[PDB]
Amino acid sequence: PVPATPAVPADFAVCEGDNIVLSTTTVAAGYNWTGPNGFTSNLQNPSVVSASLVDSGTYTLFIIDANGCPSGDTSVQVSVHPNPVQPVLSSNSAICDGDSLVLSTTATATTYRWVAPDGADTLTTVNTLVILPSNAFYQDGNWTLMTMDANGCQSILSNPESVTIHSIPAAQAV
Amino acid sequence: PVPATPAVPADFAVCEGDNIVLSTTTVAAGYNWTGPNGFTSNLQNPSVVSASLVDSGTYTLFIIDANGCPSGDTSVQVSVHPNPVQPVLSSNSAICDGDSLVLSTTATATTYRWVAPDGADTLTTVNTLVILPSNAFYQDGNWTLMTMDANGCQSILSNPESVTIHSIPAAQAV
């Protein structure tokens, strides 16, 4: 009697640079996997494929019975999403202490993480962040920016921008 | 008579970057190991697997008798814990000698090791360390920070922060 069709994971989607992990849960005399970039395996748990864009596509599996009979044909789709472009960060540096600190980009994103010199990490939905003097983020030194896209994929952390805030000199004796 | 099921290690858990070491203690005509990232071996003592997150999962073993008969099926679970993020260290540098030295982070951790320029290593449960002038840790130069998580895994030692303590000038002759 033809053995039952093996189980595979549900249609999935990964970010470029992410891991494509395929496996089955069933028991067989041997397994037979094929795929988009030559992916080939005879294991229950094939080696992990790096999520390159070339690896998009259909991954297919037909198991072997103890007596040599093949199973039916099942498959899973894998869609790899391109990694978003490096944001460019700039700022209104050479700020006199007490004025506003403005950090901005030209990048398009669902959300922007602005990362403070001290590690504090704040998130917004716009390309412009304004930090007032009383704020915990009114910091100088090197600021960085990372952006996320619609599908949840993130860009490479961008080159830092150097923020310098100047002190206000004291009144002098006359 | 079906040979006895071989022994395997107890369910284990390792940190990302750690070693997954699998072995059996029994004697066989050959061994047969399978696993999550394609791990395959026919030895009593398989090669050590680096603890990548892709290697989580079930590791399985069925031994072969001298006469060719297979053993029963036994297994061990391996759970790989992600490595905690690099702490960011900052300080109230340009301290006049005699004032307080404050080292701090934004990292979340079970415990924080603050490492002095001279190698002294002190541990706390908070993200802020205050060192007074009489203390053995009232040191200048490059300080570093490492953090541990709930599962005992440690982060990469962070970029150093430079502490400078200024001397107090002597009173002058007038």
Structure's resolution in angstroms: 3.7
Contact list, B16 vs chain A (CB under 8 Å): none
CB-based contact A119 B88, cutoff 8 Å: yes
Would an 8 Å CB–CB cutoff place B172 in contact with chain A?
Answer: no
**Which amino acid appears at position A153 of this protein?**
C
**Which amino acid appears at position B74 of this protein?**
T
Q: Give which of A148, A151, A155, A118 is closest to A135, Cα–Cα.
A: A118
Q: Find the CB nearest B38 among A46, A117, A119.
A: A46
List the structure tokens of B147: 């953090």
CA A38 remoteness from chain centre: 25
**Three-state helix/strand/coil letters over chain B:** CCCCCCCCCCCEEEECCCEECCCCCCCCCECCEECCCCCEECCCCCCCEECCHHHCEEEEECCECCCCCECCCEEEEEEEECCCCCCCEEECCCEEECECEEEEECCCCCEEEEECCCCCEEEECCCEEEECCCCCCCCCEEEEEEEECCCCCECCCCCCEEECEECCCCCCCC
* DSSP-assigned beta bridge partners for residue B12: B78
CA B55 remoteness from chain centre: 17
Residue B47 and residue B55 in contact, taking contact as beta carbons nearer than 8 Å: no
> Which residues 73-102 in chain B show a CB within 8 A of chain A?
87-88, 90
CA atoms within 13 A on the CB side of B1: 2
Q: Give which of B127, B137, B133 is closest to B104, Cα–Cα.
A: B127
CB-based contact B37 A45, cutoff 8 Å: yes
> Which residues 110-139 in chain B show a CB within 8 A of chain A?
none
CB-based contact B34 A48, cutoff 8 Å: no
Q: Give which of B64, B65, B59 is closest to B47, Cα–Cα.
A: B59
B36 CA: distance to closest CA in chain A (Å): 5
